[PDB]
Amino acid sequence: SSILSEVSTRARSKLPSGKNILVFGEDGSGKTTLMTKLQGAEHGKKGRGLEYLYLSVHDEDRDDHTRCNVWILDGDLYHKGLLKFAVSAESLPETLVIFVADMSRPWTVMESLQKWASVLREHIDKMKIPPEKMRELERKFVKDFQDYMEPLGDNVLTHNLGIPVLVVCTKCDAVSVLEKEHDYRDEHLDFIQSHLRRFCLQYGAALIYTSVKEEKNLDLLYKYIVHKTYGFHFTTPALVVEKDAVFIPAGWDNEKKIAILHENFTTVKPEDAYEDFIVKPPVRKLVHDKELAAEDEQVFLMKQQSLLAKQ
Amino acid sequence: TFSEILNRVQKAVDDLNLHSYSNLPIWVNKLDMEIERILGVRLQAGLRAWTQVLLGQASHKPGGEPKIKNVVHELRITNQVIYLNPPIEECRYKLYQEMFAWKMVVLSLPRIQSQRYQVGVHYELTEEEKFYRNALTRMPDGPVALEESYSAVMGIVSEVEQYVKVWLQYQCLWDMQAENIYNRLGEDLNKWQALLVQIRKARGTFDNAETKKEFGPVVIDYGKVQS
């Protein structure tokens, strides 16, 4: 009626809200640990299926309180349909999605990562977004990517869903242990970093290493997350200098900045298959003891019939 | 009760292991799968009952007796702004935990295992086996129960936020210039003749002996703002 116009038009200052930040990752990648520690509690509780964490963002500069929705998704594929709860076209334009590659298990990164690339893709089309809005969001994200300043290419955003994307990899401290315990070559670290940079480029994603044990880049994670979902001020440069922790702003990455990383490794060419370069982790648990089945009466008896007949 | 039944079964299985019968671990595994299916069906029934209780339409009934603690919320008026003492997001988070609760009570059960004497698996028992965390994949009805469960919450929160939304609309009564209304509707049917009618209807959700609107296990209390 008339009220809902007259009262509504009397709008005051505010800060945008109702953002649905999403998390998909391989199960057991400590994703809950990361999201909780980022939220402020050391760690909430785990479970199955979707979980909700209302991330509290306060802007001291404007002195306001807002809440975003961390919607952390279980890794089991059988729990993929409930993703239809996660994102709606009403929520879609403002949803930011991240993966959690537990670097303690590099062997499963791209697979799990590519699993993301499938699932979300399916879910983003199974919802039948009209092409006009999908295209306009896609081009808006493209422009936002191109105007980075602390690009164009053949595979730049060659397959992206038009919403801001990160690739946060947790348990960074573990890279030390698997370095010594697995004789994991530094060239391996450079190769996986390059391959991840290529992936995040073809998805226009910003990659951030982190380690809750080392509470590393956690502040940086919060900073970037708010800067992307809201538009707060950002000032941290492209921390790529040391391999221990690297931060790639979404737009910083360049195919030549990947070529320079290509140069320092000369063991096996990057073009080869991912799992070929990396060493598989062999299975430990032994196969259970074989069944000690007993020959039943019938065929035992015919065998004995034969044995007597031979006599 | 589930715990006592399972640990009694575990004691009996250990007693079986006291003697010498071949193929014991594989029999234990088959028993575990049977337990898995049975408890998965029970879990589906319990989740269905939880959905019914949450949605409001609700001695060993398969669902059980769901009970969700009332999630209280308040419309705070401090700083001349309509606050939610728990922010609307709380109205979902707590529910999820409650829903989570109603799963661990049936999901955190110890798994019957032959390792009591079969120490041949000399390895720390993995969490996804030691605690029997595969029940959800043993859905007799498929994941539909989950699809239902969240749906209820998705409904319950969503529309009740809408309710909160209505309350928030009153914000204008402290920060709004009546000159704007006057100019917008100067010389209406006579002067307004319309919004002076819809305002009377807008006196709903308000001016009633009800003090806190209950809705399922979520109660939004307009106590501080009522006057």
UniProtKB/Swiss-Prot annotation, chain A:
Q: Which GO terms describe its biological process?
A: cellular response to nerve growth factor stimulus; centrosome localization; microtubule cytoskeleton organization; microtubule-based movement
Mention any one GO cellular component term assigned to this protein in its UniProt record.
Answer: cytoplasmic dynein complex
Q: Where in the cell is it found?
A: Cytoplasm, Cytoskeleton
Q: Which domain of life is it from?
A: Eukaryota
Q: Keywords in alphabetical order, please.
A: ATP-binding, Cytoplasm, Cytoskeleton, Dynein, Methylation, Microtubule, Motor protein, Nucleotide-binding, Phosphoprotein, Transport
Q: Which is an annotated GO molecular function term of this record?
A: dynein heavy chain binding
Chain residues that bind ATP: 25-32
How this chain assembles, per its entry, is: Homodimer. The cytoplasmic dynein 1 complex consists of two catalytic heavy chains (HCs) and a number of non-catalytic subunits presented by intermediate chains (ICs), light intermediate chains (LICs) and light chains (LCs); the composition seems to vary in respect to the IC, LIC and LC composition. The heavy chain homodimer serves as a scaffold for the probable homodimeric assembly of the respective non-catalytic subunits. The ICs and LICs bind directly to the HC dimer and the LCs assemble on the IC dimer. Interacts with DYNC1H1; DYNC1LI1 and DYNC1LI2 bind mutually exclusive to DYNC1H.
Regarding protein family, the annotation reads:
Belongs to the dynein light intermediate chain family.
Summarize the protein's role. Acts as one of several non-catalytic accessory components of the cytoplasmic dynein 1 complex that are thought to be involved in linking dynein to cargos and to adapter proteins that regulate dynein function. Cytoplasmic dynein 1 acts as a motor for the intracellular retrograde motility of vesicles and organelles along microtubules. May play a role in binding dynein to membranous organelles or chromosomes.
Output this protein's name. Answer: Cytoplasmic dynein 1 light intermediate chain 2
Lineage from the top down?
Eukaryota, Metazoa, Chordata, Craniata, Vertebrata
What range of the parent protein does this fragment cover? Answer: 37 to 373 of 492
From Swiss-Prot, chain B:
User: What superkingdom heads the lineage?
Assistant: Eukaryota
Location in the cell reads: Cytoplasm, Cytoskeleton
Family of this protein: Belongs to the dynein heavy chain family.
Main function: Cytoplasmic dynein 1 acts as a motor for the intracellular retrograde motility of vesicles and organelles along microtubules. Dynein has ATPase activity; the force-producing power stroke is thought to occur on release of ADP. Plays a role in mitotic spindle assembly and metaphase plate congression.
Noted disease association is: Charcot-Marie-Tooth disease, axonal, type 2O: An axonal form of Charcot-Marie-Tooth disease, a disorder of the peripheral nervous system, characterized by progressive weakness and atrophy, initially of the peroneal muscles and later of the distal muscles of the arms. Charcot-Marie-Tooth disease is classified in two main groups on the basis of electrophysiologic properties and histopathology: primary peripheral demyelinating neuropathies (designated CMT1 when they are dominantly inherited) and primary peripheral axonal neuropathies (CMT2).
Query: Could you give the subunit structure recorded for this chain?
Result: Homodimer. The cytoplasmic dynein 1 complex consists of two catalytic heavy chains (HCs) and a number of non-catalytic subunits presented by intermediate chains (ICs), light intermediate chains (LICs) and light chains (LCs); the composition seems to vary in respect to the IC, LIC and LC composition. The heavy chain homodimer serves as a scaffold for the probable homodimeric assembly of the respective non-catalytic subunits. The ICs and LICs bind directly to the HC dimer and dynein LCs assemble on the IC dimer. Interacts with DYNC1LI1; DYNC1LI1 and DYNC1LI2 bind mutually exclusive to DYNC1H1.
- Domain comment as written in the entry: Dynein heavy chains probably consist of an N-terminal stem (which binds cargo and interacts with other dynein components), and the head or motor domain. The motor contains six tandemly-linked AAA domains in the head, which form a ring. A stalk-like structure (formed by two of the coiled coil domains) protrudes between AAA 4 and AAA 5 and terminates in a microtubule-binding site. A seventh domain may also contribute to this ring; it is not clear whether the N-terminus or the C-terminus forms this extra domain.
- The name this protein goes by in its record: Cytoplasmic dynein 1 heavy chain 1
Species of provenance: Homo sapiens
Q: Where the shown chain sits in the full protein?
A: 873 to 1114 of 4646
